[PDB]
DNA sequence: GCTGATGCGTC
DNA sequence: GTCGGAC
DNA sequence: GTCCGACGACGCATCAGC
């Protein structure tokens, strides 16, 4: 109704009409979204973030229903449904170049300031635009910005980058107040509100519950909870929240959900949006566990099963009523074109009485000559888009462990004991092509230990543990991490541990802004008496330990690298460090690296060795660089993985 | 027609 | 993928 | 326990520059 600069979606007694900063039917100003982002990032309690976002959404619902879908995508920093594959194709380099041109500054200067500040958003908004005339263009709108993000993403092929930069410069030219900050963070893929998919869904269910869509204007019902006690209100909002969450888990597509929501309302939503083959769904996830004893603590007395945890890529296989077959990744991306070989074997895995299904499987590289699982790295050499069956060279075996839908029946609310039985009886195993995950039903600690040892001997990461009947459904909305993963490298006394030298530091971004966010590490090659970069490291240390690292490594900063340090193709550190600090580092496995020089020539002529899932464990004050893990030791640890 | 840098999606 | 912080 | 965003290696896919 006035100036969006003063918009406060965090105010007390927020009124969706009277406190909006735009008029009924008007397009939602982008500045309204930006001020909402400001108020969100100012707080740390999710519940406060959700109310703030809910207030904006209620104003959108009340005043400008068509902008709901854009505003939600801007809030998630998504371009659309994950199975459609839209991607910006920008990257820091392009974004920074656009900021340079827009502000008429040198690229190197913008790059150095972004790194120093740990944030592109502040650089893009604390500098004015040269192309801007005396008369600014019209103010940006939420849907307008979203459509421009989509335009950027749809630009492909030769000469597309320059067209992308033009759109980005136009946006920065039209920005006001804090707008440029959130445009830039969105384009860089680092919106970092502290609020994401789960909080957005909560704000959306809260908003449509309190301010129903479909009302004649002016809406008679602006706050549908005002007539309820505080406790009844909270119970009601939690129930409505679960209706939305469970539907979205089954159909994580806002293009489908939002129109239904505006037309029929939330309570009728499940009737219109149901789980079905051909629509990807959210997969069930797992929590790590320390050991067998913790497994018994979380599962108490409930019977459970242990399954090999195969080291491949999750594949959600959909067989539609009528024959069509789709395959999706754990992030709902369409991998159908990547697996022509699997699509052709579907008739061979399902009994003829199966008319439709959704299977939960692990695609694993398989050596047909040796009849043996192959490592995850081999699997990754497969082509991704538009693959022809004849050209496949790395074969895949599917390891199936769950069944989510069969013959028209959703199994989401059924216990695993029944889902597994339907999987085992209606599908056919073929060695090297499609098999059921090796499993063990027991409560005996001794058997479980031997079974965990055996899973590793059989080329697996460890064990997956799942209840059979108690809280054993596939309802992600109730618990997304219902399963437990047990790997050996989670244990304190098990796993490959290395002592590596810190040779560089990278300036932190976001939460790490103003300090180091990552470090470059090296092993010691005793033949050439050089330090060879082996991996980067950015997790495992607490906020306190990280502040100590910054204090302790600041005397070691060097203007130039030492001659006996070799990094080859690794990212050049922002700060070179005199080799001195030695840290203990844990990884899940060692891999052959196309960029790191550590141990190059000892296991492969061209490739050195790096670490899979590295994490900081502790400082090794009792170790000098000469006593750090050697490149020969690295090579020996890699060979031991057979 | 080719290549290095790098985006993007696996983990 | 692992991890720690805030709730 | 949930939710979130810091950060990791790696390989195919993509495109400015040649
Ligand atoms: O390490 P993480 O949390 O990503 O592990 C979960 C992934 O493990 C894969 N996987 C392999 N074998 C199984 C079984 N038997 N059951 C469940 N998941 C399994 C999946 O790809 C999963 O995302
Ligand atoms: Mg950097
Ligand atoms: Mg895995
Ligand atoms: Mg730690
Ligand atoms: Mg590129």
XYZ file of C-alpha atoms (C1' of nucleotides) and ligand atoms in Angstrom:
705
model
C 0.000 0.000 0.000
C 3.082 2.238 0.321
C 6.864 1.884 -0.114
C 8.205 -1.713 -0.101
C 11.404 -0.354 1.455
C 9.567 -0.267 4.804
C 7.903 -3.668 4.424
C 8.111 -5.651 7.677
C 6.814 -9.229 7.371
C 8.219 -9.920 10.846
C 6.041 -7.410 12.680
C 3.659 -8.326 15.468
C -0.029 -8.784 14.594
C 0.905 -8.872 10.908
C -2.157 -8.214 8.756
C -1.950 -9.775 5.231
C -3.733 -6.789 3.593
C -3.095 -3.733 5.764
C 0.588 -4.555 6.254
C 1.319 -5.505 2.650
C 3.481 -3.127 0.608
C 1.499 -3.571 -2.627
C -2.114 -3.159 -3.684
C -4.706 -5.863 -4.459
C -4.101 -7.521 -7.820
C -0.773 -5.712 -8.172
C 2.260 -7.847 -8.945
C 4.325 -8.786 -5.889
C 7.358 -6.437 -5.818
C 10.696 -8.181 -5.662
C 11.672 -5.798 -2.853
C 8.922 -7.385 -0.748
C 10.663 -10.739 -1.217
C 14.055 -9.185 -0.467
C 12.912 -7.519 2.763
C 11.436 -10.878 3.751
C 14.836 -12.471 3.121
C 16.458 -9.751 5.245
C 14.184 -10.421 8.221
C 14.736 -14.174 7.898
C 18.534 -14.039 7.810
C 18.506 -11.683 10.820
C 17.266 -14.464 13.149
C 18.440 -17.981 13.987
C 15.228 -19.686 15.189
C 13.531 -21.561 12.336
C 10.101 -21.067 13.884
C 10.543 -17.298 13.700
C 11.750 -17.626 10.100
C 8.664 -19.661 9.230
C 6.237 -17.101 10.666
C 8.000 -14.294 8.791
C 7.821 -16.177 5.495
C 4.246 -17.248 6.251
C 3.290 -13.588 6.565
C 4.548 -12.809 3.069
C 2.799 -15.856 1.629
C -0.503 -14.871 3.245
C -0.257 -11.447 1.599
C 0.509 -13.107 -1.744
C -2.464 -15.463 -1.343
C -4.747 -12.613 -0.322
C -3.645 -10.064 -2.931
C -1.833 -11.755 -5.849
C -2.452 -15.534 -5.949
C -0.633 -16.053 -9.284
C 2.669 -14.884 -7.738
C 2.566 -17.638 -5.088
C 4.415 -20.180 -7.205
C 7.197 -17.722 -8.235
C 7.650 -16.473 -4.667
C 8.014 -20.046 -3.410
C 10.658 -20.885 -6.023
C 12.578 -17.688 -5.251
C 12.436 -18.722 -1.571
C 13.841 -22.178 -2.365
C 16.228 -20.861 -5.050
C 14.820 -23.524 -7.379
C 14.094 -23.019 -11.078
C 11.330 -25.625 -11.213
C 10.507 -29.297 -10.650
C 13.764 -31.235 -10.164
C 12.934 -33.773 -12.897
C 12.848 -31.077 -15.612
C 16.556 -30.326 -15.173
C 16.604 -26.542 -15.522
C 19.954 -25.092 -14.457
C 21.356 -21.567 -14.542
C 24.666 -22.457 -16.184
C 26.256 -19.314 -14.712
C 28.905 -19.964 -12.057
C 31.018 -17.613 -9.971
C 33.241 -16.560 -12.867
C 30.364 -15.465 -15.083
C 28.437 -13.874 -12.212
C 31.547 -11.945 -11.144
C 32.177 -10.797 -14.715
C 28.601 -9.535 -14.931
C 29.045 -7.693 -11.624
C 32.226 -6.106 -12.955
C 30.625 -4.832 -16.167
C 27.460 -3.777 -14.329
C 29.444 -1.743 -11.783
C 32.167 -0.741 -14.258
C 34.923 -2.317 -12.150
C 37.879 -4.561 -12.860
C 37.118 -8.288 -12.699
C 40.165 -8.927 -10.507
C 39.010 -6.312 -7.993
C 35.486 -7.765 -7.722
C 36.914 -11.277 -7.375
C 39.271 -10.250 -4.561
C 36.520 -8.405 -2.670
C 34.056 -11.298 -2.984
C 36.678 -13.693 -1.609
C 37.642 -11.337 1.229
C 34.015 -10.754 2.264
C 32.919 -14.365 1.736
C 29.897 -13.052 -0.140
C 29.072 -11.849 -3.642
C 25.758 -10.282 -2.602
C 27.330 -7.412 -0.678
C 29.780 -6.705 -3.511
C 26.996 -6.535 -6.093
C 24.887 -4.109 -4.026
C 27.507 -1.791 -2.497
C 28.536 -0.668 -5.997
C 26.353 1.321 -8.386
C 25.773 0.480 -12.044
C 27.466 2.459 -14.814
C 24.824 1.740 -17.464
C 22.086 3.043 -15.155
C 20.705 6.333 -16.463
C 19.441 9.186 -14.297
C 15.964 7.652 -14.530
C 16.008 4.110 -13.084
C 13.961 1.429 -14.855
C 10.698 0.225 -13.293
C 11.087 -1.766 -10.072
C 11.563 -5.512 -10.310
C 8.685 -7.888 -9.582
C 8.852 -11.339 -8.014
C 7.455 -13.146 -11.052
C 9.529 -10.952 -13.374
C 12.744 -11.918 -11.607
C 11.789 -15.588 -11.583
C 11.029 -15.504 -15.313
C 14.415 -13.879 -15.948
C 16.196 -16.591 -13.951
C 14.402 -19.087 -16.178
C 15.420 -17.181 -19.318
C 19.065 -17.387 -18.220
C 18.717 -21.142 -17.691
C 17.070 -21.715 -21.080
C 19.998 -20.065 -22.922
C 22.208 -22.880 -24.208
C 24.821 -23.501 -26.887
C 27.441 -21.320 -28.516
C 27.310 -17.599 -27.672
C 24.876 -18.249 -24.808
C 27.133 -16.889 -22.047
C 27.071 -13.316 -23.353
C 23.280 -13.465 -23.520
C 23.153 -14.694 -19.920
C 25.375 -11.821 -18.773
C 23.104 -9.291 -20.491
C 20.093 -10.536 -18.507
C 22.108 -10.467 -15.271
C 23.249 -6.890 -15.903
C 19.680 -5.793 -16.595
C 18.629 -7.181 -13.221
C 21.426 -5.412 -11.347
C 20.547 -2.181 -13.170
C 16.976 -2.345 -11.859
C 17.848 -3.365 -8.282
C 16.989 -1.169 -5.300
C 18.016 -1.316 -1.629
C 18.907 -4.938 -0.791
C 17.651 -6.499 -4.041
C 21.052 -6.913 -5.715
C 22.321 -8.823 -2.673
C 19.779 -11.614 -3.029
C 19.876 -11.648 -6.833
C 23.628 -12.290 -6.676
C 23.411 -14.931 -3.951
C 20.689 -16.716 -5.910
C 22.731 -16.736 -9.111
C 25.785 -18.011 -7.223
C 23.705 -20.889 -5.830
C 24.196 -19.718 -2.236
C 21.006 -18.026 -1.078
C 21.686 -19.323 2.486
C 18.610 -17.974 4.244
C 18.869 -20.628 6.937
C 15.394 -21.649 5.783
C 14.915 -24.291 3.103
C 12.566 -27.012 1.829
C 11.113 -28.060 5.182
C 10.600 -24.547 6.564
C 9.123 -23.331 3.253
C 6.559 -26.132 3.348
C 5.727 -25.234 6.946
C 5.279 -21.575 6.010
C 3.084 -22.567 3.062
C 0.765 -24.820 5.076
C 0.601 -22.205 7.840
C -0.207 -19.488 5.300
C -2.972 -21.243 3.377
C -4.450 -22.446 6.682
C -4.613 -18.946 8.177
C -5.516 -17.124 4.934
C -7.496 -19.532 2.714
C -7.286 -19.157 -1.066
C -10.364 -18.865 -3.234
C -12.108 -16.207 -1.136
C -13.958 -13.316 -2.724
C -12.081 -10.047 -2.301
C -11.789 -8.548 0.270
C -11.294 -11.905 2.013
C -13.642 -12.361 4.947
C -11.189 -14.824 6.547
C -7.775 -13.206 6.881
C -6.674 -15.103 10.005
C -8.515 -18.406 10.463
C -6.717 -19.201 13.729
C -7.839 -16.101 15.641
C -10.916 -17.911 16.995
C -8.950 -20.825 18.448
C -7.084 -21.130 21.707
C -3.304 -21.088 21.407
C -3.118 -24.847 21.957
C -5.907 -25.792 19.546
C -4.294 -23.529 16.952
C -0.967 -25.344 17.254
C -2.576 -28.781 16.981
C -4.554 -27.676 13.927
C -1.524 -26.172 12.173
C 0.556 -29.302 12.832
C -2.126 -31.520 11.294
C -2.439 -29.272 8.244
C 1.353 -29.192 8.056
C 1.477 -32.979 7.825
C -1.138 -33.065 5.061
C 1.060 -30.807 2.934
C 4.334 -32.515 3.854
C 3.125 -36.036 3.083
C 1.656 -34.996 -0.267
C 4.884 -33.222 -1.217
C 6.989 -36.254 -0.234
C 4.871 -38.297 -2.660
C 4.778 -35.549 -5.317
C 7.617 -33.040 -4.758
C 6.422 -30.803 -7.597
C 5.129 -27.311 -6.816
C 3.821 -26.961 -10.393
C 1.334 -29.723 -9.553
C 0.611 -28.813 -5.940
C 0.137 -25.028 -6.001
C -2.696 -24.827 -8.603
C -4.626 -27.545 -6.743
C -4.001 -25.745 -3.461
C -5.388 -22.435 -4.751
C -8.429 -24.071 -6.345
C -9.483 -26.859 -3.950
C -7.666 -26.072 -0.691
C -5.259 -27.999 1.482
C -7.679 -30.482 3.082
C -8.641 -31.825 -0.370
C -5.029 -31.915 -1.600
C -4.294 -35.667 -1.189
C -7.307 -36.498 -3.343
C -5.773 -34.602 -6.286
C -2.018 -35.245 -5.831
C -1.209 -38.900 -5.125
C 1.894 -41.032 -5.408
C 1.981 -42.665 -8.836
C 4.499 -44.245 -11.235
C 6.158 -41.674 -13.470
C 6.246 -38.995 -10.743
C 9.465 -39.124 -8.672
C 9.161 -39.210 -4.894
C 11.371 -38.383 -1.954
C 13.562 -41.370 -1.010
C 13.963 -42.777 2.475
C 17.261 -41.757 4.087
C 19.442 -43.024 6.912
C 21.129 -41.752 10.080
C 24.708 -42.792 10.942
C 25.322 -44.956 13.998
C 28.397 -45.404 16.175
C 28.199 -49.164 16.651
C 25.970 -52.180 17.114
C 25.117 -51.112 20.673
C 23.678 -47.806 19.453
C 21.575 -49.698 16.901
C 19.960 -51.586 19.779
C 19.402 -48.308 21.652
C 17.550 -46.558 18.825
C 15.529 -49.645 17.852
C 15.039 -50.839 21.441
C 13.175 -54.183 21.227
C 11.781 -53.832 17.688
C 12.796 -56.571 15.279
C 15.003 -55.299 12.454
C 16.900 -56.513 9.391
C 20.494 -55.927 8.310
C 21.309 -55.372 4.627
C 24.544 -54.849 2.735
C 25.059 -51.166 1.934
C 26.125 -51.296 -1.723
C 28.377 -48.541 -3.071
C 26.646 -47.292 -6.197
C 23.967 -44.765 -7.178
C 20.374 -44.812 -6.004
C 17.942 -45.651 -8.795
C 14.182 -45.282 -8.322
C 12.602 -47.418 -11.045
C 9.030 -46.635 -12.118
C 7.023 -49.044 -14.269
C 3.805 -47.417 -15.429
C 0.480 -48.991 -16.193
C 0.916 -49.518 -19.956
C 4.630 -50.364 -20.188
C 6.502 -47.056 -19.965
C 9.534 -47.093 -17.636
C 11.202 -44.134 -15.909
C 14.237 -44.009 -13.651
C 15.015 -41.201 -11.226
C 17.929 -40.333 -8.964
C 17.688 -39.698 -5.230
C 17.208 -36.005 -6.082
C 14.281 -36.642 -8.472
C 16.410 -36.092 -11.569
C 15.431 -38.070 -14.656
C 18.028 -40.778 -15.391
C 15.842 -42.700 -17.853
C 18.082 -41.877 -20.821
C 21.174 -43.004 -18.890
C 20.035 -46.629 -18.383
C 18.857 -48.060 -21.717
C 20.284 -51.401 -20.593
C 18.142 -51.453 -17.452
C 14.984 -50.427 -19.297
C 15.419 -53.384 -21.662
C 15.768 -55.847 -18.771
C 12.574 -54.812 -16.944
C 10.499 -57.601 -18.567
C 13.069 -60.032 -17.136
C 12.833 -58.806 -13.519
C 9.045 -58.680 -12.989
C 6.651 -61.609 -13.046
C 3.928 -61.230 -15.698
C 1.313 -60.475 -13.028
C 3.061 -57.164 -12.246
C 1.301 -54.312 -14.079
C 3.024 -51.365 -12.352
C 5.554 -50.680 -9.638
C 8.048 -48.351 -8.026
C 11.271 -50.049 -6.890
C 14.040 -48.691 -4.660
C 17.428 -49.968 -5.847
C 21.152 -49.353 -5.964
C 22.712 -49.375 -9.423
C 26.221 -50.858 -9.039
C 28.953 -51.319 -11.647
C 29.327 -55.031 -12.371
C 32.174 -56.912 -14.061
C 30.582 -59.650 -16.171
C 33.930 -61.297 -16.955
C 34.942 -61.526 -13.279
C 31.348 -61.691 -11.925
C 32.234 -59.104 -9.314
C 31.091 -55.736 -7.997
C 33.202 -52.805 -9.193
C 34.004 -49.608 -7.253
C 31.868 -46.475 -7.400
C 34.529 -44.719 -9.505
C 34.037 -47.226 -12.328
C 30.288 -46.644 -12.254
C 30.834 -42.894 -12.651
C 32.486 -43.444 -16.061
C 29.093 -44.189 -17.633
C 27.600 -41.618 -19.956
C 24.704 -39.590 -18.605
C 22.552 -38.143 -21.395
C 21.072 -39.845 -24.450
C 22.831 -43.184 -24.142
C 22.431 -45.958 -26.711
C 22.465 -49.532 -25.410
C 25.074 -50.673 -27.940
C 27.653 -48.174 -26.636
C 27.465 -49.255 -22.971
C 30.803 -50.562 -21.701
C 30.363 -50.469 -17.904
C 27.612 -52.933 -17.012
C 25.302 -52.388 -14.040
C 23.680 -54.764 -11.589
C 20.633 -53.570 -9.665
C 20.464 -54.374 -5.959
C 16.838 -53.965 -4.945
C 15.908 -53.296 -1.331
C 12.445 -51.739 -1.321
C 9.136 -51.578 -3.133
C 6.985 -48.478 -2.823
C 4.063 -49.144 -5.170
C 2.693 -52.285 -6.805
C -0.227 -52.932 -9.157
C -1.946 -49.672 -8.257
C -1.336 -49.888 -4.491
C 0.761 -47.312 -2.698
C 2.851 -49.095 -0.068
C 3.986 -45.921 1.721
C 2.002 -46.757 4.875
C 2.732 -50.485 4.813
C 5.438 -51.970 7.075
C 8.707 -53.108 5.553
C 7.954 -56.716 6.492
C 5.107 -56.665 3.965
C 6.857 -54.480 1.372
C 9.860 -56.807 1.378
C 7.638 -59.864 1.009
C 5.866 -58.344 -1.999
C 9.276 -57.509 -3.478
C 10.671 -61.012 -2.938
C 7.631 -62.773 -4.415
C 6.791 -60.656 -7.485
C 10.298 -60.051 -8.873
C 12.890 -62.415 -10.339
C 16.593 -62.451 -9.510
C 19.315 -62.786 -12.137
C 22.929 -62.805 -10.987
C 24.848 -59.808 -12.300
C 21.629 -58.113 -13.477
C 18.962 -57.848 -10.753
C 19.213 -59.250 -7.227
C 17.796 -58.672 -3.765
C 20.094 -57.040 -1.237
C 21.887 -59.605 0.887
C 20.164 -59.452 4.257
C 20.095 -60.957 7.727
C 17.221 -60.939 10.234
C 18.690 -61.294 13.726
C 19.157 -59.651 17.094
C 22.389 -61.504 17.944
C 25.267 -59.040 18.319
C 27.752 -61.760 17.364
C 26.047 -62.557 14.054
C 25.709 -58.853 13.234
C 29.427 -58.291 13.788
C 30.356 -61.181 11.500
C 27.783 -59.910 8.982
C 29.258 -56.401 8.994
C 32.737 -57.837 8.479
C 31.379 -59.960 5.641
C 29.634 -57.064 3.882
C 32.973 -55.251 3.601
C 34.725 -58.401 2.372
C 32.011 -58.531 -0.320
C 32.765 -55.012 -1.654
C 30.176 -53.011 0.302
C 30.317 -49.951 2.516
C 28.780 -51.668 5.531
C 25.240 -52.349 6.732
C 21.813 -50.761 6.485
C 19.533 -51.539 9.448
C 15.743 -51.329 9.205
C 12.830 -52.183 11.485
C 10.411 -54.731 10.048
C 7.126 -53.863 11.769
C 7.496 -51.019 14.330
C 7.706 -47.567 12.715
C 8.743 -49.441 9.584
C 6.711 -47.626 6.913
C 7.909 -45.507 3.962
C 6.331 -42.247 5.231
C 9.057 -39.651 4.710
C 6.858 -36.912 6.166
C 6.883 -38.642 9.564
C 10.614 -39.417 9.456
C 12.910 -38.905 6.482
C 15.842 -40.716 8.147
C 14.022 -43.833 9.316
C 16.894 -46.244 8.520
C 20.313 -46.571 10.143
C 23.587 -46.833 8.245
C 26.496 -48.568 9.959
C 29.911 -48.114 8.331
C 33.256 -49.075 9.843
C 34.796 -45.616 9.321
C 32.141 -44.147 11.651
C 33.802 -45.960 14.576
C 36.446 -44.255 16.702
C 38.821 -47.239 16.593
C 38.226 -48.297 12.973
C 38.912 -46.579 9.662
C 41.846 -45.250 7.659
C 43.498 -42.302 9.423
C 46.263 -40.131 7.959
C 48.565 -37.424 9.316
C 48.777 -34.683 6.685
C 50.539 -31.310 6.427
C 48.602 -28.067 6.003
C 50.109 -26.223 3.030
C 47.412 -23.651 2.230
C 44.174 -22.020 3.283
C 41.065 -20.836 1.452
C 39.046 -17.838 2.606
C 35.654 -18.853 3.941
C 32.240 -18.167 2.440
C 28.892 -17.656 4.139
C 29.029 -19.029 7.680
C 32.833 -19.174 7.286
C 33.150 -15.563 6.068
C 35.868 -13.653 7.882
C 37.998 -16.728 8.553
C 39.334 -19.773 6.735
C 36.729 -22.178 5.399
C 39.021 -24.801 3.938
C 42.588 -26.013 3.887
C 44.917 -27.720 1.453
C 46.740 -30.776 2.764
C 49.751 -32.752 1.603
C 51.531 -36.035 2.182
C 55.322 -36.301 2.258
C 57.174 -37.902 -0.665
C 60.397 -39.136 0.905
C 62.071 -39.962 -2.425
C 61.939 -36.372 -3.713
C 61.715 -34.899 -0.182
C 58.749 -32.837 -1.367
C 55.256 -32.254 -0.023
C 52.537 -33.352 -2.446
C 48.986 -32.035 -2.262
C 46.540 -34.868 -1.562
C 43.181 -33.252 -0.759
C 41.287 -30.245 0.548
C 39.609 -30.254 3.955
C 36.584 -28.327 5.157
C 34.718 -30.269 7.833
C 35.293 -32.071 11.123
C 36.304 -29.024 13.191
C 34.035 -27.115 15.541
C 33.618 -23.347 15.365
C 36.036 -23.073 18.295
C 38.674 -25.366 16.771
C 38.367 -23.400 13.529
C 39.059 -20.103 15.288
C 42.127 -21.695 16.883
C 43.338 -22.855 13.465
C 43.046 -19.297 12.194
C 45.076 -18.051 15.157
C 47.713 -20.782 14.896
C 48.167 -20.673 11.109
C 48.399 -16.881 10.796
C 52.105 -16.722 11.646
C 52.676 -19.311 8.901
C 51.201 -17.256 6.032
C 53.655 -16.896 3.161
C 53.589 -14.482 0.200
C 54.939 -17.168 -2.155
C 54.853 -20.984 -2.144
C 57.833 -23.004 -1.029
C 59.768 -24.652 -3.886
C 59.472 -28.137 -2.339
C 55.646 -27.949 -2.227
C 53.861 -29.464 -5.246
C 50.145 -28.952 -5.884
C 49.901 -29.451 -9.680
C 46.258 -28.912 -10.647
C 44.741 -28.270 -7.211
C 42.936 -25.013 -6.515
C 45.600 -22.453 -5.636
C 45.130 -21.468 -1.963
C 44.261 -17.900 -1.110
C 46.969 -18.081 1.583
C 50.074 -20.218 1.230
C 51.200 -21.653 4.575
C 54.708 -22.575 5.632
C 54.563 -26.377 6.124
C 54.395 -27.011 9.861
C 50.962 -27.971 11.170
C 50.126 -31.684 10.929
C 46.500 -32.773 11.262
C 44.955 -36.194 11.692
C 42.442 -36.796 8.892
C 39.877 -39.553 8.406
C 38.460 -40.740 5.093
C 36.156 -43.505 3.909
C 38.515 -44.628 1.121
C 41.335 -43.452 -1.133
C 40.707 -42.695 -4.813
C 42.789 -42.244 -7.961
C 42.868 -38.571 -8.638
C 43.106 -36.769 -11.998
C 44.439 -33.620 -10.282
C 46.292 -34.427 -7.026
C 50.021 -35.314 -7.274
C 50.266 -37.285 -4.026
C 51.909 -40.636 -4.760
C 51.625 -40.104 -8.515
C 53.552 -42.867 -10.255
C 53.315 -45.366 -7.382
C 49.879 -46.812 -8.253
C 49.226 -45.187 -11.643
C 51.444 -43.404 -14.144
C 49.318 -40.266 -14.548
C 47.137 -40.222 -11.444
C 47.968 -39.467 -7.852
C 45.742 -40.347 -4.933
C 43.153 -38.344 -2.981
C 40.742 -38.933 -0.067
C 37.043 -39.788 -0.195
C 34.922 -37.906 2.361
C 37.871 -36.385 4.276
C 37.295 -34.833 7.683
C 39.456 -33.211 10.344
C 39.952 -35.373 13.446
C 42.544 -33.597 15.606
C 45.765 -31.607 15.541
C 48.955 -33.697 15.700
C 51.188 -31.408 17.756
C 53.498 -34.404 18.288
C 54.287 -34.618 14.541
C 56.513 -32.551 12.282
C 56.077 -32.582 8.477
C 58.896 -35.138 8.066
C 56.866 -37.557 10.219
C 53.598 -37.039 8.339
C 52.079 -39.883 6.332
C 54.310 -40.584 3.348
C 53.284 -40.886 -0.280
C 54.468 -44.506 -0.165
C 52.181 -45.172 2.806
C 49.296 -43.618 0.865
C 50.021 -45.911 -2.077
C 50.080 -48.889 0.289
C 46.757 -47.897 1.858
C 45.173 -47.595 -1.590
C 46.434 -51.003 -2.743
C 45.005 -52.593 0.409
C 41.486 -51.697 -0.776
C 41.889 -54.439 -3.449
C 37.128 -29.739 -35.032
C 39.611 -29.778 -30.749
C 40.663 -28.529 -25.657
C 40.767 -26.580 -20.898
C 37.974 -24.645 -17.705
C 34.204 -25.563 -15.289
C 29.224 -26.389 -14.607
C 26.278 -30.095 -12.544
C 25.032 -34.083 -10.447
C 26.668 -38.424 -8.350
C 28.724 -39.977 -4.050
C 29.058 -37.294 0.736
C 30.610 -35.696 6.509
C 30.141 -32.570 9.867
C 28.802 -29.145 13.731
C 25.457 -25.333 15.216
C 20.923 -23.804 16.718
C 16.766 -25.059 18.036
C 16.172 -35.704 16.269
C 15.389 -32.038 12.760
C 16.910 -28.812 9.653
C 20.404 -26.235 7.591
C 24.491 -24.762 5.166
C 29.606 -24.850 5.599
C 32.873 -27.816 3.182
C 35.006 -32.703 0.277
C 36.471 -35.936 -4.665
C 35.135 -37.026 -9.072
C 33.554 -37.590 -14.027
C 30.621 -36.534 -17.910
C 28.560 -32.411 -20.254
C 29.095 -28.035 -21.834
C 31.202 -23.793 -24.251
C 34.708 -19.729 -25.008
C 38.596 -19.746 -27.234
C 41.362 -21.406 -30.219
O 25.733 -42.852 3.029
P 24.265 -42.589 2.792
O 23.420 -41.947 3.866
O 24.023 -41.660 1.516
O 23.693 -44.040 2.485
C 22.388 -44.206 1.953
C 22.440 -44.718 0.539
O 22.886 -46.083 0.538
C 22.470 -46.702 -0.648
N 22.157 -48.108 -0.337
C 22.929 -49.194 -0.671
N 22.423 -50.359 -0.243
C 21.264 -49.991 0.410
C 20.282 -50.745 1.077
N 20.341 -52.095 1.188
N 19.254 -50.078 1.629
C 19.200 -48.740 1.524
N 20.065 -47.933 0.920
C 21.093 -48.611 0.366
C 21.279 -45.906 -1.201
O 21.635 -45.381 -2.467
C 21.111 -44.769 -0.183
O 20.783 -43.526 -0.767
Mg 37.513 -18.927 -2.804
Mg 26.531 -44.973 -1.284
Mg 35.181 -33.113 15.092
Mg 31.480 -23.537 -18.628
